[PDB]
């Protein structure tokens, strides 16, 4: 897919609730891409547990609004 829609890909990746937000439960699949650590769009499958903290790092830091979820504008900033 193309990067632009791939942003919505990170959104729909685990958003089966349509609340326009992603909790860690959702983000467990998505943040593997969104939280670019040792890569850009590529999933840095380095260590699942470290990746868990990476996911936390999203809900704790990449979440700029302190809501604990990642919105389109949030992950857009995070993946770019
Ligand atoms: Ca959701
Ligand atoms: Ca948020």
């Amino acid at each position: 897919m193309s990067p632009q829609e791939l942003q919505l890909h990170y959104f729909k990746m685990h958003d089966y609730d349509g609340n326009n937000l992603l909790d860690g439960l959702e983000l467990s699949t998505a943040i593997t891409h969104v939280h670019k650590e040792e890569g850009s769009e590529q999933a840095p499958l380095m260590s699942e547990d470290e990746l868990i903290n990476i996911i936390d790092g999203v809900l704790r830091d990449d979440d700029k609004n302190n809501d604990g979820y990642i919105d389109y504008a949030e992950f857009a900033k995070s993946l770019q």
Side-chain angles (χ1 to χ4, degrees):
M1 297 299 294
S2 177
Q4 49 169 29
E5 50 229 44
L6 279 183
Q7 304 176 90
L8 186 64
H9 166 56
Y10 296 9
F11 188 79
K12 303 313 298 180
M13 174 89 286
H14 235 216
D15 175 67
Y16 315 101
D17 60 59
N19 76 331
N20 205 92
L21 283 175
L22 297 168
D23 184 84
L25 311 183
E26 303 177 76
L27 286 185
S28 51
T29 328
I31 293 301
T32 311
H33 288 268
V34 198
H35 191 93
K36 58 167 194 290
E37 202 59 82
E38 303 185 282
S40 307
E41 67 271 80
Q42 288 179 87
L45 296 176
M46 51 197 174
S47 302
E48 71 291 88
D49 285 304
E50 181 175 75
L51 202 69
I52 293 174
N53 296 145
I54 258 59
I55 297 177
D56 286 0
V58 170
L59 285 64
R60 306 193 176 133
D61 190 80
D62 291 280
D63 155 74
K64 317 313 296 181
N65 342 91
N66 285 85
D67 46 67
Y69 309 98
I70 209 171
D71 164 68
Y72 205 99
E74 295 184 85
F75 60 63
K77 291 187 301 283
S78 187
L79 62 89
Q80 290 304 270

